[PDB]
Each structure stands twice: as structure tokens, then as C-alpha cells.
Amino acid sequence: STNEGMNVKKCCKGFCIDILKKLSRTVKFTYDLYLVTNGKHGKKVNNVW
Amino acid sequence: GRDEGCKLVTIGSGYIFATTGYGIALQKGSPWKRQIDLALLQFVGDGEMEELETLWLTGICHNEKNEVMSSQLDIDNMAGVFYMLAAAMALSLITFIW
Amino acid sequence: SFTIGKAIWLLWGLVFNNSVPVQNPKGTTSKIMVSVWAFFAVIFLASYTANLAAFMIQEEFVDQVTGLSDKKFQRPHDYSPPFRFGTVPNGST
Amino acid sequence: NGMIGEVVYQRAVMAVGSLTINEERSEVVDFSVPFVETGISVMVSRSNGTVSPSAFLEPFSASVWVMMFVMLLIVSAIAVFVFEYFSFTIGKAIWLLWGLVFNNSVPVQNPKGTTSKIMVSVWAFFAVIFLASYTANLAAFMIQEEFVDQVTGLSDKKFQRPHDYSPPFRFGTVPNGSTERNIRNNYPYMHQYMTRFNQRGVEDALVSLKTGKLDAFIYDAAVLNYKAGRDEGCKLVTIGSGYIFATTGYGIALQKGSPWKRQIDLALLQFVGDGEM
Amino acid sequence: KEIPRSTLDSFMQPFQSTLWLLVGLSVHVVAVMLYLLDRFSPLTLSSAMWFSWGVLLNSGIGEGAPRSFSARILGMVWAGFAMIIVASYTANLAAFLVLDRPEERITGINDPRLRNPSDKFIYATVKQSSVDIYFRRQVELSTMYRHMEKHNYESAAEAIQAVRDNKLHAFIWDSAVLEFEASQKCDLVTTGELFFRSGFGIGMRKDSPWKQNVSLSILKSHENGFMEDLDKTWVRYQETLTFENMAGVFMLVAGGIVAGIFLIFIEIAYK
Ligand SMILES: *[C@@H]1O[C@H](CO)[C@@H](O)[C@H](O)[C@H]1NC(C)=O
Numbered sequence: 039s040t041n042e043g044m045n046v047k048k049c050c051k052g053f054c055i056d057i058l059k060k061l062s063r064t065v066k067f068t069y070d071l072y073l074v075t076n077g078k079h080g081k082k083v084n085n086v087w
Numbered sequence: 088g089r090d091e092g093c094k095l096v097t098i099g100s101g102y103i104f105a106t107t108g109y110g111i112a113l114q115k116g117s118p119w120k121r122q123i124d125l126a127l128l129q130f131v132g133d134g135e136m137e138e139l140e141t142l143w144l145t146g147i148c149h150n151e152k153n154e155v156m157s158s159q160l161d162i163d164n165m166a167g168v169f170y171m172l173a174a175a176m177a178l179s180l181i182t183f184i185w
Numbered sequence: 186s187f188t189i190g191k192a193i194w195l196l197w198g199l200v201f202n203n204s205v206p207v208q209n210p211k212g213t214t215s216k217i218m219v220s221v222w223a224f225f226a227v228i229f230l231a232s233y234t235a236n237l238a239a240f241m242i243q244e245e246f247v248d249q250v251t252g253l254s255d256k257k258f259q260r261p262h263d264y265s266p267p268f269r270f271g272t273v274p275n276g277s278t
Numbered sequence: 279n280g281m282i283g284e285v286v287y288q289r290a291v292m293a294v295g296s297l298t299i300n301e302e303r304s305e306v307v308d309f310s311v312p313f314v315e316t317g318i319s320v321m322v323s324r325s326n327g328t329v330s331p332s333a334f335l336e337p338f339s340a341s342v343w344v345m346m347f348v349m350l351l352i353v354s355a356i357a358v359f360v361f362e363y364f365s366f367t368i369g370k371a372i373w374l375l376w377g378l379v380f381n382n383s384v385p386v387q388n389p390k391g392t393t394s395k396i397m398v399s400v401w402a403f404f405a406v407i408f409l410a411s412y413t414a415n416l417a418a419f420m421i422q423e424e425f426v427d428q429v430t431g432l433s434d435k436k437f438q439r440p441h442d443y444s445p446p447f448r449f450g451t452v453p454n455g456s457t458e459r460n461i462r463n464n465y466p467y468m469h470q471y472m473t474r475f476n477q478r479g480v481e482d483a484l485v486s487l488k489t490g491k492l493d494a495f496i497y498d499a500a501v502l503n504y505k506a507g508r509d510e511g512c513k514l515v516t517i518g519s520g521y522i523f524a525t526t527g528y529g530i531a532l533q534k535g536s537p538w539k540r541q542i543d544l545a546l547l548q549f550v551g552d553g554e555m
Numbered sequence: 556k557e558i559p560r561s562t563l564d565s566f567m568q569p570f571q572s573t574l575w576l577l578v579g580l581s582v583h584v585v586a587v588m589l590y591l592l593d594r595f596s597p598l599t600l601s602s603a604m605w606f607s608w609g610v611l612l613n614s615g616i617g618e619g620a621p622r623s624f625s626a627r628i629l630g631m632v633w634a635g636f637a638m639i640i641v642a643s644y645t646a647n648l649a650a651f652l653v654l655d656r657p658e659e660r661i662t663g664i665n666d667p668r669l670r671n672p673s674d675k676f677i678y679a680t681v682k683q684s685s686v687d688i689y690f691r692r693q694v695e696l697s698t699m700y701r702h703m704e705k706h707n708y709e710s711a712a713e714a715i716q717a718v719r720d721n722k723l724h725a726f727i728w729d730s731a732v733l734e735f736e737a738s739q740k741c742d743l744v745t746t747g748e749l750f751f752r753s754g755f756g757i758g759m760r761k762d763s764p765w766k767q768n769v770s771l772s773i774l775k776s777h778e779n780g781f782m783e784d785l786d787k788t789w790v791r792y793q794e795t796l797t798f799e800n801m802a803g804v805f806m807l808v809a810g811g812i813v814a815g816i817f818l819i820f821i822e823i824a825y826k
Pocket residue numbers: 083274275
């Protein structure tokens with residue numbers, strides 16, 4: 039019923055995590071990693087992604 | 088590859104499908120396109136991507152194992168021998184009428 | 186004394202040697218030809234059993250559906266079990 | 279002489295390459311920690327051979343044959359019971375029942391009372407599945423394949439004298455090598471029968487093994503493992519895995535009292551302690 | 556990797572129930588139609604049944620031959636039928652008991668089901684071992700560290716009894732000790748891939764007069780075969796049968812013998 043929540047810190051490993059870490063080794067950018075809370079990958083629901 | 092028992096197997100190797108890939112989506116107008124593309128080609132160009140694929144892809148269930156799946160039974164073989172048997176019944180009828 | 190046309194039944198019952206009591210061949214040449222035929226049948230049996238064993242060893246695997254354009258992908262009433270397949274919701278697929 | 283002469287007379291600091299470990303080197307110099315498990319081994323002719331089907335005890339094990347004799351006695355007793363009703367199947371019932379296992383006996387008289395026919399049917403189905411199991415055991419005999427070593431190890435009775443056994447053979451090592459001192463400190467007669475059977479080059483010794491100019495050869499284990507891992511012809515699966523052999527390692531020789539020794543030992547244990555070795 | 560194979564050989568009853576009923580109904584229909592063909596000729600029923608069982612049976616029996624002007628064609632078809640059945644059955648039973656060998660093992664440390672573990676593959680080690688330090692140093696082994704730290708044991712014999720009771724599914728340990736346990740307990744088999752080839756020596760103090768001569772004495776023990784003698788004392792010193800398969804076959808054979816004897820009592824009581 040409400041839209042208030044918390045930002046839980048969670049660990050991330052895997053293939054794309056290694057891709058991101060090696061790109062940070064090469065391109066030298068600091069990642070700002072978080073998860074999606076809107077939902078799934080993406081779909082244009084009535085001209086709204 | 089992590090299928091316990093090697094039961095669930097895909098159809099071949101993806102022949103009759105969309106045949107696409109994965110990439111990194113950026114905003115329309117980002118200046119980081121070319122450097123990230125050259126870095127991805129560098130990761131392809133040295134096998135470091137292949138090292139990560141070796142690390143992060145299981146490969147135990149190989150393609151078309153010759154395991155215990157032969158259940159000591161065929162149905163079609165004695166079915167065709169029964170078709171030959173029905174032909175033998177027909178030839179017996181032909182030799183019996185004359 | 187009756188192995189004129191009955192020799193075919195004798196021969197293709199002794200291709201397999203399935204205990205077919207036929208006759209006593211008093212002719213020596215007939216016994217020699219039966220011996221050669223029996224040795225031929227033994228090596229043919231060994232070759233056929235080896236062929237069956239190697240065909241078990243050469244183990245291929247057919248598939249139920251080998252295409253996205255399959256006729257099974259038109260209607261599951263086309264065959265007697267109606268098979269089932271879905272996708273993920275709200276997905277690109 | 280060689281690297282030992284260079285280190286002892288101090289025209290060099292250390293030797294990096296492949297180097298055995300024995301008493302006289304530890305007398306004159308100091309080894310490092312060993313980094314690789316490298317003993318010695320023997321490369322022999324080791325031809326194809328056969329699969330050796332000497333004896334089989336899997337289907338019957340000299341005790342199903344008891345069941346054969348028991349059911350022969352049972353069939354003979356019921357043949358006497360058939361003869362009570364009604365014809366030489368009293369003592370001939372054994373030859374009748376066990377001659378039809380291999381389905382080529384002379385056709386003996388059989389009664390019309392169906393009793394002998396039923397028990398011949400049961401015994402015959404048992405013989406059919408027994409021959410099926412026998413052919414299956416012969417088919418599963420193909421699964422294992424190993425030609426055994428003619429020489430078990432360095433303590434072989436062949437190594438006492440090649441004239442003691444019917445084929446004479448031959449074996450060598452390297453001239454002016456450490457294996458000479460490794461053998462002569464333990465087996466002088468080995469060297470006395472080996473001295474006529476010397477050679478020059480390790481690959482030359484391999485060619486002499488392939489072309490039949492040499493029967494056996496004694497060298498380091500991992501070097502012959504590498505030679506088996508590069509062999510053309512693939513007729514070389516060596517004697518065991520270093521069971522009855524010197525079983526040493528490779529080290530780095532330093533001066534007696536060099537300050538580098540502890541650091542080199544820690545560096546080698548770091549190189550093993552991360553999988554980089 | 557110790558699970559018995561072919562405990563009953565799947566002859567008729569562990570196999571699916573077609574072939575006995577199929578061959579029985581087949582020989583029944585064949586015997587009926589050949590006896591009816593013998594009636595319409597262009598102990599006769601007993602002779603036809605005996606001929607059917609003998610052609611289906613392939614051993615050798617002193618039987619006669621009925622009037623078979625067209626029945627010998629059906630008999631030779633039945634003969635080829637019977638031999639292709641028994642040949643197919645012998646061939647696929649043999650070829651099934653050849654290829655009855657899965658991969659039940661792990662094949663070394665490079666197992667992604669152990670890199671990405673689960674609640675099934677329970678692998679652990681001795682609590683506070685140097686194996687734990689060796690896996691704690693390396694950068695990509697912390698997941699196996701997290702898996703093993705839940706179920707580490709105090710001594711190795713505890714793990715031996717646990718995997719003997721199948722409470723463990725894998726156990727990282729030194730090679731020759733597990734080879735010795737394989738020699739002791741035959742229900743314990745190691746894996747093939749050898750990783751981290753290490754050395755076992757003597758724990759020593761700092762700079763001491765026993766630093767040099769003890770190493771010299773170990774080298775003296777290696778130059779002779781005294782270590783080989785110690786291997787002979789402890790390392791080398793190790794420790795279709797048709798009796799689980801064809802035992803019930805023989806029991807059904809003896810039951811058929813008794814039932815056939817009783818049926819022959821009934822037959823002599825009638826005839
Ligand atoms: C999928 O899309 C619909 C569109 O209304 C949305 O309501 C739903 O929450 C989404 N989630 C599912 C079921 O995948």
C-alpha cells in the first residue's frame with residue numbers, strides 16, 4: 039500500500055561481474071552498482087518503458 | 088551442463104533460432120561507446136574472455152553421451168518383423184487358396 | 186529320398202539351425218556341402234551379432250522436434266499427446 | 279666437472295636446470311627445496327602383446343557346475359520315473375542333457391510323455407541364457423585392456439642375469455651421469471652388465487629402442503614421461519609411476535652459506551602455493 | 556563410486572512384461588493356425604506343439620514332421636523369427652552390460668558443481684588444516700572455503716567414518732593416505748587428477764646441529780631401498796557371477812520342475 043522501503047546492501051558475483059571488474063581494470067571507471075526495482079528486463083507498456 | 092543426470096538437453100546447438108548476442112546498452116549520445124567497444128575487442132583479442140568462459144561455463148554433460156539411456160528394448164524392430172509376419176500370413180493365404 | 190524341393194526348407198532351416206529334423210543325408214557330397222553351409226552360417230551369425238553390438242555402440246539420438254517451423258508447432262491435436270511449452274512473462278522472447 | 283665444478287670453484291652462483299639429488303652434491307654444495315616430484319624410471323621395448331585370456335571364473339566359479347550335476351541327477355531320476363510308465367536314458371541322460379547345452383549332440387530317443395520334453399525345455403532355456411551370459415562376459419572382456427610389464431621393477435630377477443631367462447636383453451644409462459653413481463652405490467653388478475651396453479644420446483637411445491638396437495634404458499621419470507607425451511608411434515606406456523625407483527626431486531644448488539637460500543626456498547613455496555607451478 | 560551393477564540382469568521380470576507374453580501368444584497363434592492348416596491338408600496337436608516349441612527353442616529334439624506342403628514355409632519364417640529374437644536379445648543384453656558405466660566421480664578440483672556448490676555435493680576437510688590455509692590464500696577458492704567451513708571435522712578418521720556412512724560426498728585429502736585407506740577399505744576410491752604435488756618431511760627447529768645431518772640421513776635413506784622396504788611394509792601391503800543374478804532363475808527352474816512333476820502326475824492319472 040505504501041512505496042517506502044530500504045536500500046539493502048547485497049553481494050554480487052558471476053560472469054558479468056567479472057566483465058565489469060575487468061572493464062574497471064581497463065577503462066578505469068568506478069561502478070555504481072544497484073538492482074532494478076521496477077521489475078523485469080524491459081517492455082514498452084503503452085509507450086512507457 | 089549443471090543438469091544432474093544429463094537429462095535436459097537442448098536441441099542440437101541452436102541452428103534454427105534467432106542467433107543473437109549480448110552487449111552493453113548505453114544512452115544515445117554517450118561518449119563511452121568506442122573505448123568500451125575497443126576494450127571488449129581487447130578482451131576477445133587475448134583470450135581473457137575465453138578464460139572467463141572457461142571459469143564460468145560448466146561442461147560436464149557433453150553433446151550426445153552414449154550412456155544408460157538404451158533401456159534394453161526396441162519397439163520398432165519386432166514391429167517391422169511383425170509386418171514381415173503379416174506378409175507371411177498373406178503368402179500363407181495365397182498358398183492355401185492354391 | 187525326398188530332398189528335391191524339400192532341400193530349400195532344409196537349407197533355410199539350417200541357415201539358422203533351429204532343431205529342424207529333416208533327413209539323413211547318405212550322400213557324402215551333400216554332407217560336405219551341409220558342413221560348408223554350416224560353417225558359413227556360423228560365421229554369418231557371428232558377423233550379425235557383431236553388427237548388432239556395433240549398432241548399439243554406434244548410438245545416435247533422434248529428436249522429437251527439430252525445428253521452430255515444425256508441423257507440431259501448428260496444433261497439438263495433430264498428434265495424440267498435446268505437448269506444452271511456454272515462455273517467461275513480459276520477456277523479449 | 280660441469281655445473282658442480284662451476285659452482286664449487288665459484289665461477290657461477292647457482293644452477294637452475296634439471297639436477298638430481300645425491301650425497302656427494304650435498305657434501306660439496308647446498309640444495310634448495312624440491313619443487314617437482316621427479317624420480318627415475320625405465321623405458322623398455324613394451325610391444326603390443328595380447329589381452330591374455332588365461333582363465334575365466336566369472337560365470338560359473340567352479341560352483342554352478344555343482345548345480346549342473348544336481349540337475350543332471352534330477353533329470354536322470356525323472357527319466358527313471360518316465361521309464362516306470364513305459365529307452366536307454368538311465369546313464370545316458372547326463373550326455374543327453376549336457377550335450378544339448380552345446381546343441382550338436384546325436385538325436386537320442388525322447389519319450390512321448392512330454393516330461394523329458396518339459397525338462398529339456400527348462401534346461402535348454404537355462405543353457406540359452408547361460409550362453410548369452412557367456413558371450414556377454416566375452417564382450418565385456420574387451421572393456422579392460424592392459425599388456426603387463428615384463429619387468430616388475432629394479433629388483434627384477436631379469437636384472438640379476440639376462441642369461442638366467444631365455445631371451446637375452448640389454449639396458450643402459452648416460453655416460454658420466456649421476457645415475458651411474460646412483461646405481462654403483464647400490465648395485466655394482468648392474469653396472470658390470472651395463473658397461474658393454476652403453477649409449478651416447480637420449481633421443482639416440484630412443485631411436486635405438488624403436489629400431490631394435492636397444493631393449494631397455496634407465497633415465498629420469500618425468501623426462502621419459504615427456505618423451506611419452508611427445509612420442510610418435512605411441513608404443514611407450516612406462517613401467518608404473520615410479521614405484522620401485524629413486525624417487526627424488528629437482529633443486530637449486532647454491533654455495534655453502536649463501537644468503538639467497540632462504541629467499542629462494544620461500545619463493546619456490548610461493549610459486550607452488552598459488553598454482554602457478 | 557561403489558554401487559553394484561546388474562544385480563538381476565533384467566531377464567524377464569525386472570524387464571518390461573512384453574516379451575514372455577508376446578512370444579507365448581505368438582507361438583500359441585502359430586501352433587493353432589498350423590494345426591488348422593494340418594486339418595485342411597492340401598497326437599497331431601501334440602506334434603504341432605512340440606514342433607513349435609522345438610523350432611522356437613533351438614536345442615535338438617527327436618521329433619517328427621507333419622504334412623507341411625505349405626506349413627514348412629510358415630515354419631521356416633518362424634525359425635528365422637526365433638533366431639532373430641534370440642540373437643537380438645543376446646546382443647542387446649551383452650551390449651547393455653558392456654556400456655553400463657557412468658561417470659559418478661568429480662575429476663579433480665575443476666568441477667563447476669563444486670565451484671558453484673549445493674546441498675548435495677558435501678565436501679569438507681579437517682578443521683584447522685594446512686589445506687584450509689592453502690585454499691584461503693588463493694583468490695578464487697573462497698566459495699569452497701565457505702562450503703567446507705560449515706562441516707569441517709576434527710580428525711580425518713571422523714571423515715572416513717562419515718563418508719563410510721555416506722554423510723559426506725567428497726573429501727579433500729593427501730594422496731597416499733587415501734590410497735592406504737583404499738587398500739584397507741575397498742569401498743573407497745580416490746579421483747584421478749593429481750593437484751598440488753607436495754612434500755612430507757620432518758618438522759624442525761631453527762639453526763641447530765640437527766639441521767644438516769638429519770637431511771643427510773634422509774638422503775641416505777633415499778639413496779638405498781630402505782624407503783622402498785618401508786613402502787613394502789605399509790604402502791604396497793594391500794588388503795555376471797550368476798549368484799545374485801541366476802539364483803532366482805534356478806529357484807524358478809526348481810519350482811517349474813516341481814510343477815511339471817505334478818502336471819505329469821495329472822497326465823498319467825488321465826492317460
Ligand atoms: C507483466 O506485465 C503486466 C502488464 O500489466 C504487469 O501487470 C505485470 O505485473 C508484469 N509481471 C509479470 C506477471 O510478468
